[PDB]
Amino acid sequence: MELSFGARAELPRIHPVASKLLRLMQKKETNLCLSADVSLARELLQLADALGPSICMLKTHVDILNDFTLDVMKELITLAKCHEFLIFEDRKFADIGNTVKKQYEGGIFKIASWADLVNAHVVPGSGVVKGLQEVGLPLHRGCLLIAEMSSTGSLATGDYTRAAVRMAEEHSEFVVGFISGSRVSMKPEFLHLTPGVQLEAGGDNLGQQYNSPQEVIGKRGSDIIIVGRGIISAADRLEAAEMYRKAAWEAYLSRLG
C-alpha cells in the first residue's frame, strides 16, 4: 500500500534530507522541482524568489553561471529557507572516489557547503558513493543515484539500472533516492525524481525526450517531476509552474487513492 509523502517523512529508516523534503512537499502541495538552467546569478535568484512558493526543490547547474560566487549561494539559501525548498546541484559526479570527494568539497564551487542534494552516475562503481559520503555525511547531505536517463540512446537500462538500485540500498545512510524515469525501488524510503517532463509530447534536437506529469507520476510511479524549459521558456513562468505543480500533485493524489 502507497503511503502519503507526509507518512513517508516519518518512516524509521528515512534519511533526514528526504524527510525534510517530504514534509515540505506535503505542506505546500508540491512535487515539482524547477530546473533553473540560467547563465546569470540575478536570473537564478529572480526565478527562485518568484517560483519558490510553487516548488519543493530548485535544481542548479552552478557550472553554467557566468557570475557564480559563494555570496550568490548564501542568498539562494536565504530564499530556500524563506520559501521552503531544497537545493539540488545537478553535478552528475562520475569519477573515482578519490576525485569526487575533492570535486564535492572543494574548488571554487564548494558544492557540499550549500547543496542539500547532489547526484552521481553509478558507472564508476560504488567508490563514487564512498568518496562523496566522506564529505556529505558530516555535512548532513544526501545523494541521488542516476538509475535511468531521459535522453535518446541512454545506456542506463537493464542490469545498469539494477546496479544503481543495489548501490543505493547498500549506501542508504547517504543515498536518498534516484534520478529515473519510473519507480525502480519498492522501498518507500527512497525518492524518485524524473527529468524529461513537459505537458506536451516531444523532445529537443539534442536527444532530450519528454513525458507528461500524469505519465511519470501517475503511471510510472515516480515522486517528483523535474521541469526546465517547460516552465522557463513560457511567457508566464508563474502560471506555467502552477500548471506543472497541479499536474504532478493531482497525479500523486490519484495514485494514492
Place this chain on the structure above:
Amino acid sequence: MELSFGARAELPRIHPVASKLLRLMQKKETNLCLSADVSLARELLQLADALGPSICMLKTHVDILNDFTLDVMKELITLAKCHEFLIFEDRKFADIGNTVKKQYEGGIFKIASWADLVNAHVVPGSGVVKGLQEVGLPLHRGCLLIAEMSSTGSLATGDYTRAAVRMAEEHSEFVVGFISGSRVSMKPEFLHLTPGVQLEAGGDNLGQQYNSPQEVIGKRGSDIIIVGRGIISAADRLEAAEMYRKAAWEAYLSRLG
C-alpha cells in the same frame, strides 16, 4: 601491424588535435599524461613548467583548483606551447546534449577556451557528443569517450564498451579516442589513454586499481598512461615523471618490434 606515433600522425582520417599530439609524442619520446591533481594554481603551474618536457599531455580537474582564474589557464597555455604538450580537462561530461554544450562553453571555467581535449561518458547516449561538438568542432578541439574505467565495480564493460566504440566511430570529426584500460578499437586513428597506472601494485581505499606501464602499454595495447599520485606524491616529481616516461616509452617501443 603496429604503427609508430609519427606514422599515425599522418593517417588520412586523423583529427588535427590527434595529429598534433602524436607528432609531439614522437618528437619528445613521451607517452605520459600527467594527472595534475592539485588544489593550488601555483603548484599546477610549477608542475607544468618542470614536468612539461617529460609529458605529452597535462590532465586537469579545474573544479578542484581553489584559486582558478582564466589568467591561470592563460599561463598554462603558455607553458603548453613552450614545452609542447596538450591540455586535457577531465570533466567527464555526462548530461543531455543541451546541458553539456553550456557546461563546455560557459560558466566560470569556459573550458572550451583553453582545453585541447575533454572527455565524456557515453551513458546519456550520443547527444552528449553532439552537444560538445557544437562548441568544439570550430575550435579544433577533440573529445575522448570513456569506454572503460579503472575503478572497482565499474559498469563500463561489455555492451557498454562496445557502445562507446560505435559512438566514437560515428562521430570521428570530433571524437579522437578513448579512456580505457586497454585497446578497444583497432582503428589506428583513435588514441587510447589509460588511467589507474602506477609502477607498484595496488589501489587506494576508494576503489582505484593500478596496473604497471608495461602491462598497460605493452600487453594491453594502450597508447598513453595517465599518472597522478604515482608522480604527484613523490618527493621529486620530476624524477618520478622521468621514470614513468621511460617505462611507458620503452613499453611502446617493445610492441612496435
